[PDB]
Design a protein around this nucleic acid. Structure first.
Ligand SMILES: [Ca+2]
Ligand SMILES: [Ca+2]
Ligand SMILES: [Ca+2]
Ligand SMILES: [Ca+2]
Ligand SMILES: [Ca+2]
Ligand SMILES: [Ca+2]
Ligand SMILES: [Ca+2]
Length: 112
RNA sequence: GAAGCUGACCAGACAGUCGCCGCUUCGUCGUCGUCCUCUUCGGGGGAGACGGGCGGAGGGGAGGAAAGUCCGGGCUCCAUAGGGCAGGGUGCCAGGUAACGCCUGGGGGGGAAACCCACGACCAGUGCAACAGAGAGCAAACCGCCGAUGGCCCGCGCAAGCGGGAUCAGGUAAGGGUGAAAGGGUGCGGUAAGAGCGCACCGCGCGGCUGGUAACAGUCCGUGGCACGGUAAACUCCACCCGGAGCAAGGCCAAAUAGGGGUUCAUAAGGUACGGCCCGUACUGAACCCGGGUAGGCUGCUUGAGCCAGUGAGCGAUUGCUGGCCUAGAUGAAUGACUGUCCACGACAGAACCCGGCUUAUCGGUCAGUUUC
Protein backbone atom coordinates (compact mmCIF):
# COMPACT_ATOMS: atom_id res chain seq x y z
CA UNK A 1 0.00 0.00 0.00
CA UNK A 2 0.99 3.72 -0.51
CA UNK A 3 -1.41 5.55 1.86
CA UNK A 4 -0.29 8.60 3.94
CA UNK A 5 -1.99 8.25 7.35
CA UNK A 6 -2.18 10.79 10.23
CA UNK A 7 0.11 8.38 12.15
CA UNK A 8 2.90 9.26 9.60
CA UNK A 9 2.84 13.09 10.24
CA UNK A 10 4.91 14.94 12.93
CA UNK A 11 1.77 16.55 14.43
CA UNK A 12 3.31 18.49 17.46
CA UNK A 13 6.09 21.13 17.99
CA UNK A 14 8.14 18.89 20.34
CA UNK A 15 8.51 16.36 17.46
CA UNK A 16 10.08 19.12 15.29
CA UNK A 17 12.43 20.11 18.14
CA UNK A 18 13.71 16.50 18.51
CA UNK A 19 15.03 16.23 14.93
CA UNK A 20 16.63 19.72 15.23
CA UNK A 21 18.71 18.42 18.24
CA UNK A 22 20.58 15.78 16.14
CA UNK A 23 19.83 16.18 12.37
CA UNK A 24 21.43 14.39 9.47
CA UNK A 25 21.21 17.09 6.70
CA UNK A 26 20.82 17.34 2.90
CA UNK A 27 19.83 20.38 0.75
CA UNK A 28 20.11 22.48 -2.43
CA UNK A 29 20.34 26.33 -2.73
CA UNK A 30 16.46 26.31 -2.55
CA UNK A 31 15.15 23.26 -0.57
CA UNK A 32 16.49 21.27 2.44
CA UNK A 33 15.88 18.09 4.49
CA UNK A 34 16.74 17.12 8.08
CA UNK A 35 16.29 13.71 9.77
CA UNK A 36 17.09 11.45 12.79
CA UNK A 37 16.67 7.65 13.21
CA UNK A 38 13.54 6.59 15.17
CA UNK A 39 12.23 3.46 17.01
CA UNK A 40 8.74 3.38 15.31
CA UNK A 41 10.06 1.08 12.48
CA UNK A 42 8.78 3.29 9.57
CA UNK A 43 9.60 6.83 8.23
CA UNK A 44 7.70 10.06 9.22
CA UNK A 45 7.66 13.68 7.90
CA UNK A 46 6.75 17.22 9.02
CA UNK A 47 6.40 20.33 6.82
CA UNK A 48 7.29 23.94 7.50
CA UNK A 49 7.53 26.66 4.83
CA UNK A 50 8.22 30.23 5.97
CA UNK A 51 5.81 33.03 4.90
CA UNK A 52 9.07 35.09 4.63
CA UNK A 53 10.33 32.80 1.80
CA UNK A 54 6.97 32.07 0.07
CA UNK A 55 4.26 34.81 0.10
CA UNK A 56 0.53 34.30 -0.93
CA UNK A 57 -1.54 31.29 0.17
CA UNK A 58 -2.07 29.60 -3.26
CA UNK A 59 1.68 29.21 -3.24
CA UNK A 60 2.95 27.30 -0.16
CA UNK A 61 -0.19 25.10 -0.63
CA UNK A 62 1.37 23.96 -3.94
CA UNK A 63 4.67 23.08 -2.19
CA UNK A 64 2.78 21.09 0.49
CA UNK A 65 0.70 19.26 -2.20
CA UNK A 66 3.78 18.32 -4.28
CA UNK A 67 6.13 17.41 -1.38
CA UNK A 68 3.50 15.31 0.57
CA UNK A 69 3.09 13.32 -2.69
CA UNK A 70 6.82 12.68 -3.36
CA UNK A 71 7.22 11.32 0.19
CA UNK A 72 4.40 8.69 0.11
CA UNK A 73 5.30 7.55 -3.46
CA UNK A 74 8.76 6.51 -2.05
CA UNK A 75 7.65 5.30 1.43
CA UNK A 76 9.31 1.83 1.50
CA UNK A 77 12.75 2.80 -0.02
CA UNK A 78 14.40 4.87 2.82
CA UNK A 79 15.18 4.05 6.54
CA UNK A 80 12.74 4.58 9.49
CA UNK A 81 13.77 8.24 10.07
CA UNK A 82 11.78 11.17 11.39
CA UNK A 83 12.19 13.92 8.71
CA UNK A 84 11.64 17.69 8.44
CA UNK A 85 11.49 19.60 5.12
CA UNK A 86 11.91 23.40 4.84
CA UNK A 87 11.81 25.90 1.94
CA UNK A 88 14.56 28.56 1.48
CA UNK A 89 13.85 31.90 -0.39
CA UNK A 90 14.57 30.50 -3.92
CA UNK A 91 11.72 27.88 -4.44
CA UNK A 92 8.67 30.01 -5.21
CA UNK A 93 8.97 30.08 -9.08
CA UNK A 94 10.05 26.42 -9.73
CA UNK A 95 7.41 24.56 -11.82
CA UNK A 96 5.96 21.21 -10.60
CA UNK A 97 8.58 19.27 -12.62
CA UNK A 98 11.40 21.44 -11.17
CA UNK A 99 10.62 20.48 -7.55
CA UNK A 100 10.07 16.80 -8.46
CA UNK A 101 13.37 16.42 -10.43
CA UNK A 102 15.26 17.78 -7.35
CA UNK A 103 13.56 15.84 -4.49
CA UNK A 104 14.67 12.52 -6.12
CA UNK A 105 18.38 13.52 -6.45
CA UNK A 106 18.10 14.97 -2.91
CA UNK A 107 16.84 11.64 -1.44
CA UNK A 108 19.65 9.90 -3.43
CA UNK A 109 22.02 11.62 -0.88
CA UNK A 110 20.51 9.53 2.01
CA UNK A 111 23.03 6.63 1.78
CA UNK A 112 22.61 5.53 5.49
C1' G B 1 -16.72 46.89 -41.91
C1' A B 2 -13.23 50.15 -39.22
C1' A B 3 -11.18 51.76 -31.55
C1' G B 4 -12.64 52.16 -26.89
C1' C B 5 -16.25 51.75 -22.77
C1' U B 6 -20.43 49.75 -19.87
C1' G B 7 -23.23 45.33 -18.46
C1' A B 8 -23.28 39.63 -18.69
C1' C B 9 -21.41 34.86 -18.24
C1' C B 10 -16.59 33.02 -17.82
C1' A B 11 -11.06 32.47 -17.16
C1' G B 12 -11.19 25.38 -18.82
C1' A B 13 -13.63 19.64 -20.24
C1' C B 14 -13.82 14.35 -19.88
C1' A B 15 -11.46 9.40 -18.98
C1' G B 16 -7.86 6.16 -16.52
C1' U B 17 -5.01 5.02 -10.53
C1' C B 18 -2.82 6.50 -6.78
C1' G B 19 -4.09 9.34 -2.52
C1' C B 20 -6.20 13.49 1.21
C1' C B 21 -10.76 15.36 4.59
C1' G B 22 -15.55 15.34 6.33
C1' C B 23 -21.13 13.45 5.18
C1' U B 24 -24.90 9.57 4.90
C1' U B 25 -25.89 4.50 5.83
C1' C B 26 -25.42 -0.98 6.39
C1' G B 27 -23.95 -4.67 9.10
C1' U B 28 -18.65 -5.43 12.26
C1' C B 29 -16.13 -4.55 17.65
C1' G B 30 -15.89 -3.02 22.48
C1' U B 31 -19.35 -1.48 26.39
C1' C B 32 -24.08 -1.34 28.89
C1' G B 33 -20.89 2.39 32.73
C1' U B 34 -29.13 3.57 29.96
C1' C B 35 -32.12 -0.64 30.44
C1' C B 36 -36.24 -2.22 26.43
C1' U B 37 -37.19 -7.65 27.98
C1' C B 38 -35.07 -7.48 31.76
C1' U B 39 -32.47 -12.60 30.80
C1' U B 40 -28.73 -17.05 30.62
C1' C B 41 -26.51 -11.35 33.56
C1' G B 42 -24.49 -13.23 27.73
C1' G B 43 -25.77 -8.79 26.95
C1' G B 44 -28.90 -10.93 22.73
C1' G B 45 -32.36 -6.42 17.92
C1' G B 46 -28.89 -5.04 22.88
C1' A B 47 -33.84 -0.11 24.72
C1' G B 48 -28.36 3.40 24.00
C1' A B 49 -24.08 6.38 23.41
C1' C B 50 -19.42 6.58 21.88
C1' G B 51 -14.90 5.22 19.87
C1' G B 52 -10.87 2.64 12.93
C1' G B 53 -15.94 0.03 16.53
C1' C B 54 -14.25 -1.78 11.75
C1' G B 55 -15.10 -3.63 6.67
C1' G B 56 -18.17 -2.14 3.07
C1' A B 57 -21.28 1.08 0.00
C1' G B 58 -23.33 5.54 -1.66
C1' G B 59 -22.69 10.62 -2.33
C1' G B 60 -19.48 15.28 -1.62
C1' G B 61 -15.11 19.08 -0.93
C1' A B 62 -11.34 26.50 -2.70
C1' G B 63 -13.92 33.30 -4.94
C1' G B 64 -15.81 36.88 -8.03
C1' A B 65 -12.35 38.57 -5.52
C1' A B 66 -12.20 33.61 -0.61
C1' A B 67 -7.65 39.01 -0.96
C1' G B 68 -7.97 44.06 2.56
C1' U B 69 -8.12 45.87 8.21
C1' C B 70 -11.87 49.88 5.89
C1' C B 71 -17.54 50.95 7.22
C1' G B 72 -22.48 48.79 9.10
C1' G B 73 -24.90 44.37 11.74
C1' G B 74 -25.78 39.58 14.49
C1' C B 75 -23.95 36.55 18.57
C1' U B 76 -21.28 36.20 23.36
C1' C B 77 -18.49 37.71 27.65
C1' C B 78 -17.25 42.07 30.37
C1' A B 79 -17.96 47.41 32.14
C1' U B 80 -21.61 51.22 33.29
C1' A B 81 -25.03 57.28 39.08
C1' G B 82 -23.83 60.86 35.37
C1' G B 83 -23.21 66.46 35.50
C1' G B 84 -19.29 68.42 32.78
C1' C B 85 -14.46 68.34 29.79
C1' A B 86 -11.66 65.77 26.18
C1' G B 87 -11.67 62.83 21.62
C1' G B 88 -13.78 60.64 16.93
C1' G B 89 -17.71 60.64 13.19
C1' U B 90 -21.82 62.67 9.94
C1' G B 91 -23.50 67.22 7.97
C1' C B 92 -28.90 70.28 0.74
C1' C B 93 -34.25 67.54 0.11
C1' A B 94 -37.41 63.09 0.09
C1' G B 95 -37.09 57.85 0.17
C1' G B 96 -34.93 52.21 0.64
C1' U B 97 -32.74 49.11 4.40
C1' A B 98 -31.81 45.67 10.34
C1' A B 99 -27.96 49.27 9.92
C1' C B 100 -24.09 52.49 7.56
C1' G B 101 -19.29 56.72 5.63
C1' C B 102 -24.13 52.02 1.33
C1' C B 103 -28.38 52.49 -2.62
C1' U B 104 -32.25 55.19 -5.48
C1' G B 105 -34.89 59.72 -7.16
C1' G B 106 -34.95 65.00 -6.87
C1' G B 107 -32.59 70.41 -5.83
C1' G B 108 -28.34 73.47 -6.47
C1' G B 109 -23.63 73.65 -8.13
C1' G B 110 -22.08 73.15 -14.99
C1' G B 111 -26.68 70.08 -13.39
C1' A B 112 -20.35 69.00 -19.31
C1' A B 113 -16.51 67.88 -20.77
C1' A B 114 -19.89 69.39 -14.10
C1' C B 115 -19.27 61.41 -17.99
C1' C B 116 -18.40 65.63 -12.13
C1' C B 117 -19.76 67.47 -6.86
C1' A B 118 -14.75 66.63 1.21
C1' C B 119 -22.61 70.05 -2.09
C1' G B 120 -24.07 73.09 7.26
C1' A B 121 -20.93 78.70 9.19
C1' C B 122 -17.06 83.53 5.52
C1' C B 123 -16.50 85.41 9.77
C1' A B 124 -13.94 84.81 15.57
C1' G B 125 -8.34 86.13 14.51
C1' U B 126 -5.34 85.61 10.21
C1' G B 127 -3.04 84.46 5.36
C1' C B 128 -4.58 87.48 -1.04
C1' A B 129 -1.84 87.23 -4.41
C1' A B 130 4.85 87.57 -5.09
C1' C B 131 3.63 92.23 -7.34
C1' A B 132 0.38 96.78 -7.04
C1' G B 133 -2.88 101.37 -6.16
C1' A B 134 -5.13 94.70 -7.46
C1' G B 135 -4.95 92.37 -1.44
C1' A B 136 -11.29 92.58 1.75
C1' G B 137 -12.72 97.72 -1.34
C1' C B 138 -7.05 98.69 -1.69
C1' A B 139 -6.38 103.32 -4.36
C1' A B 140 0.09 105.88 -8.23
C1' A B 141 -6.58 109.80 -12.22
C1' C B 142 -0.86 106.46 -15.03
C1' C B 143 -2.07 111.33 -20.29
C1' G B 144 -5.52 114.97 -17.99
C1' C B 145 -6.51 117.12 -12.59
C1' C B 146 -2.90 123.42 -16.44
C1' G B 147 -7.41 120.01 -18.57
C1' A B 148 -8.79 128.81 -16.24
C1' U B 149 -12.15 124.59 -11.80
C1' G B 150 -10.55 126.39 -8.32
C1' G B 151 -6.62 129.24 -6.77
C1' C B 152 -2.67 131.36 -8.52
C1' C B 153 1.04 131.38 -12.02
C1' C B 154 2.99 134.56 -14.91
C1' G B 155 4.39 135.60 -20.46
C1' C B 156 0.95 137.90 -23.54
C1' G B 157 -1.86 144.99 -23.62
C1' C B 158 -4.95 146.16 -17.26
C1' A B 159 -5.96 141.71 -20.13
C1' A B 160 -10.66 140.56 -19.77
C1' G B 161 -9.14 136.70 -25.83
C1' C B 162 -3.99 133.09 -25.69
C1' G B 163 -0.66 129.61 -23.31
C1' G B 164 1.68 127.48 -19.32
C1' G B 165 2.48 126.20 -13.61
C1' A B 166 -0.37 121.33 -11.09
C1' U B 167 -0.92 124.52 -7.17
C1' C B 168 -3.77 120.76 -3.36
C1' A B 169 -4.17 113.92 -6.31
C1' G B 170 -5.70 118.39 -8.91
C1' G B 171 -15.50 116.87 -9.18
C1' U B 172 -11.44 111.23 -10.99
C1' A B 173 -11.12 105.80 -8.53
C1' A B 174 -10.30 102.62 -10.47
C1' G B 175 -13.90 109.10 -15.77
C1' G B 176 -10.97 106.79 -18.17
C1' G B 177 -4.95 104.20 -17.94
C1' U B 178 0.12 99.87 -19.12
C1' G B 179 1.63 97.60 -15.13
C1' A B 180 -2.90 91.01 -12.87
C1' A B 181 -6.73 89.79 -10.26
C1' A B 182 -10.34 94.14 -10.76
C1' G B 183 -17.02 96.14 -4.03
C1' G B 184 -22.19 96.19 -10.14
C1' G B 185 -23.51 96.55 -15.69
C1' U B 186 -24.85 98.86 -21.02
C1' G B 187 -26.88 103.19 -22.62
C1' C B 188 -28.45 108.91 -21.84
C1' G B 189 -27.23 117.10 -22.00
C1' G B 190 -23.71 111.48 -18.10
C1' U B 191 -19.45 117.81 -17.01
C1' A B 192 -14.32 121.08 -16.06
C1' A B 193 -11.72 116.17 -18.60
C1' G B 194 -17.16 112.67 -13.39
C1' A B 195 -18.58 109.42 -10.99
C1' G B 196 -25.67 105.59 -8.61
C1' C B 197 -24.01 110.89 -10.01
C1' G B 198 -29.01 112.06 -12.20
C1' C B 199 -32.14 109.06 -15.41
C1' A B 200 -33.54 104.57 -18.70
C1' C B 201 -33.24 99.10 -19.10
C1' C B 202 -30.64 95.14 -16.75
C1' G B 203 -28.30 93.34 -12.30
C1' C B 204 -28.31 92.34 -7.02
C1' G B 205 -30.50 92.92 -2.35
C1' C B 206 -34.51 92.59 0.80
C1' G B 207 -40.01 91.88 1.25
C1' G B 208 -44.44 89.97 -1.32
C1' C B 209 -46.68 85.91 -4.51
C1' U B 210 -47.49 81.31 -7.49
C1' G B 211 -45.72 76.71 -8.20
C1' G B 212 -44.00 72.67 -5.33
C1' U B 213 -43.79 67.07 -0.07
C1' A B 214 -39.14 69.90 0.28
C1' A B 215 -34.59 71.39 -1.02
C1' C B 216 -35.51 75.42 -4.58
C1' A B 217 -37.39 78.18 -8.90
C1' G B 218 -39.93 82.21 -11.82
C1' U B 219 -38.87 90.19 -14.19
C1' C B 220 -44.41 87.39 -11.55
C1' C B 221 -45.67 92.06 -7.71
C1' G B 222 -42.74 95.76 -4.68
C1' U B 223 -37.64 97.29 -5.40
C1' G B 224 -32.11 100.65 -2.28
C1' G B 225 -29.93 104.06 -6.31
C1' C B 226 -27.78 99.44 -3.13
C1' A B 227 -25.12 97.76 2.01
C1' C B 228 -17.99 90.98 2.16
C1' G B 229 -14.94 89.91 -3.38
C1' G B 230 -12.72 85.13 -2.53
C1' U B 231 -10.82 80.94 1.06
C1' A B 232 -13.16 76.70 6.34
C1' A B 233 -8.37 69.27 1.79
C1' A B 234 -7.91 77.67 6.84
C1' C B 235 -7.05 77.43 11.99
C1' U B 236 -13.56 78.90 13.55
C1' C B 237 -18.29 78.02 15.01
C1' C B 238 -23.07 75.29 15.00
C1' A B 239 -26.32 70.63 15.12
C1' C B 240 -26.68 65.56 16.05
C1' C B 241 -24.55 60.72 17.31
C1' C B 242 -20.70 58.02 19.66
C1' G B 243 -18.92 51.67 26.27
C1' G B 244 -14.65 47.55 25.81
C1' A B 245 -13.22 42.58 23.58
C1' G B 246 -13.30 38.19 20.15
C1' C B 247 -15.36 31.65 18.24
C1' A B 248 -8.21 29.72 22.03
C1' A B 249 -15.93 34.95 22.20
C1' G B 250 -18.57 31.90 25.25
C1' G B 251 -20.51 27.79 27.50
C1' C B 252 -21.07 22.53 29.49
C1' C B 253 -18.43 18.03 31.31
C1' A B 254 -14.16 17.58 33.47
C1' A B 255 -9.04 18.78 36.80
C1' A B 256 -7.07 20.58 41.27
C1' U B 257 -3.66 21.93 47.52
C1' A B 258 -5.71 27.35 48.12
C1' G B 259 -2.51 26.80 53.96
C1' G B 260 1.46 32.82 60.12
C1' G B 261 0.75 37.54 57.19
C1' G B 262 -0.85 40.90 54.24
C1' U B 263 1.10 47.14 52.91
C1' U B 264 -1.60 45.63 61.02
C1' C B 265 -3.21 50.20 55.95
C1' A B 266 -6.88 50.51 60.59
C1' U B 267 -10.33 54.51 61.96
C1' A B 268 -10.50 53.38 56.53
C1' A B 269 -6.36 53.68 53.66
C1' G B 270 -5.43 54.16 48.44
C1' G B 271 -6.54 50.44 45.53
C1' U B 272 -10.04 50.49 40.69
C1' A B 273 -14.76 50.51 38.01
C1' C B 274 -17.45 54.39 36.60
C1' G B 275 -13.49 57.71 33.30
C1' G B 276 -8.87 59.51 28.36
C1' C B 277 -9.87 63.62 32.45
C1' C B 278 -12.54 66.10 36.84
C1' C B 279 -16.89 65.45 40.02
C1' G B 280 -18.57 63.03 42.17
C1' U B 281 -20.41 57.77 43.13
C1' A B 282 -19.86 53.52 43.97
C1' C B 283 -16.97 49.07 45.83
C1' U B 284 -14.21 48.88 50.16
C1' G B 285 -10.50 46.28 50.19
C1' A B 286 -4.76 43.85 52.77
C1' A B 287 2.77 44.84 47.13
C1' C B 288 1.41 37.24 48.87
C1' C B 289 2.46 34.56 51.84
C1' C B 290 0.93 29.60 51.66
C1' G B 291 0.35 27.62 46.54
C1' G B 292 -1.12 23.97 42.54
C1' G B 293 -4.05 22.69 38.69
C1' U B 294 -6.36 22.82 33.82
C1' A B 295 -3.07 22.28 30.41
C1' G B 296 -8.42 17.37 27.68
C1' G B 297 -13.21 16.67 25.24
C1' C B 298 -17.96 18.15 23.36
C1' U B 299 -20.60 22.34 21.58
C1' G B 300 -20.95 27.25 19.43
C1' C B 301 -20.49 25.35 13.13
C1' U B 302 -22.39 26.27 8.60
C1' U B 303 -30.42 27.19 7.16
C1' G B 304 -28.20 32.49 5.10
C1' A B 305 -31.71 40.03 7.49
C1' G B 306 -30.94 32.62 1.76
C1' C B 307 -32.20 30.81 -3.25
C1' C B 308 -35.86 29.79 -7.34
C1' A B 309 -40.37 30.37 -9.82
C1' G B 310 -45.02 32.53 -10.45
C1' U B 311 -48.07 37.00 -9.57
C1' G B 312 -49.18 42.47 -7.32
C1' A B 313 -47.05 47.74 -6.12
C1' G B 314 -43.15 51.49 -7.45
C1' C B 315 -40.15 56.35 -12.02
C1' G B 316 -36.21 54.00 -9.18
C1' A B 317 -33.56 51.70 -4.72
C1' U B 318 -36.67 48.03 -3.43
C1' U B 319 -40.87 45.16 -1.83
C1' G B 320 -46.26 42.67 -0.65
C1' C B 321 -48.40 37.86 -1.80
C1' U B 322 -48.40 32.04 -3.16
C1' G B 323 -45.79 27.60 -4.41
C1' G B 324 -41.34 25.30 -3.91
C1' C B 325 -35.30 24.13 -2.62
C1' C B 326 -30.12 23.26 -0.04
C1' U B 327 -23.56 17.41 0.73
C1' A B 328 -16.58 23.14 2.14
C1' G B 329 -15.68 23.25 7.79
C1' A B 330 -10.00 21.61 8.01
C1' U B 331 -7.09 21.95 13.06
C1' G B 332 1.66 21.40 10.93
C1' A B 333 -4.35 22.74 9.12
C1' A B 334 -7.86 18.66 3.61
C1' U B 335 -6.75 18.40 -4.94
C1' G B 336 -1.17 14.61 -8.12
C1' A B 337 0.20 12.00 -12.49
C1' C B 338 -0.61 9.88 -17.49
C1' U B 339 -3.72 10.70 -22.29
C1' G B 340 -6.22 13.01 -26.31
C1' U B 341 -9.16 17.19 -27.83
C1' C B 342 -10.42 22.64 -26.83
C1' C B 343 -6.75 28.31 -27.20
C1' A B 344 -10.34 31.22 -23.72
C1' C B 345 -3.16 27.11 -25.01
C1' G B 346 -6.34 28.64 -19.05
C1' A B 347 -5.11 35.62 -15.33
C1' C B 348 -5.43 37.20 -10.26
C1' A B 349 -5.76 34.30 -6.28
C1' G B 350 -8.14 30.97 -1.23
C1' A B 351 -11.71 29.81 3.13
C1' A B 352 -11.39 29.84 9.45
C1' C B 353 -18.06 32.01 13.62
C1' C B 354 -21.38 34.19 10.24
C1' C B 355 -24.48 38.30 7.25
C1' G B 356 -24.83 43.96 4.21
C1' G B 357 -21.35 47.48 1.56
C1' C B 358 -16.72 49.72 -0.17
C1' U B 359 -11.63 49.12 -1.89
C1' U B 360 -7.67 46.73 -4.13
C1' A B 361 -5.46 42.28 -7.80
C1' U B 362 -6.40 40.33 -12.56
C1' C B 363 -3.46 36.53 -19.50
C1' G B 364 -7.83 36.56 -22.07
C1' G B 365 -12.63 35.02 -24.01
C1' U B 366 -17.41 35.06 -26.17
C1' C B 367 -21.87 37.80 -25.79
C1' A B 368 -25.29 42.30 -25.29
C1' G B 369 -25.44 47.42 -25.22
C1' U B 370 -23.15 52.18 -26.56
C1' U B 371 -19.76 56.24 -28.16
C1' U B 372 -16.60 55.66 -32.23
C1' C B 373 -14.57 53.60 -37.96
CA1 LIG C 1 -15.31 30.37 -11.80
CA1 LIG D 1 -10.83 38.82 5.60
CA1 LIG E 1 -11.59 33.25 27.80
CA1 LIG F 1 -15.61 24.18 14.41
CA1 LIG G 1 -6.62 29.35 14.90
CA1 LIG H 1 -22.01 38.14 0.71
CA1 LIG I 1 -19.12 40.37 3.73
Amino acid sequence: KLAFPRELRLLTPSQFTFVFQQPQRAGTPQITILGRLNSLGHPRIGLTVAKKNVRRAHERNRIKRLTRESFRLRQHELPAMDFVVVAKKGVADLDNRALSEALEKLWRRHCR
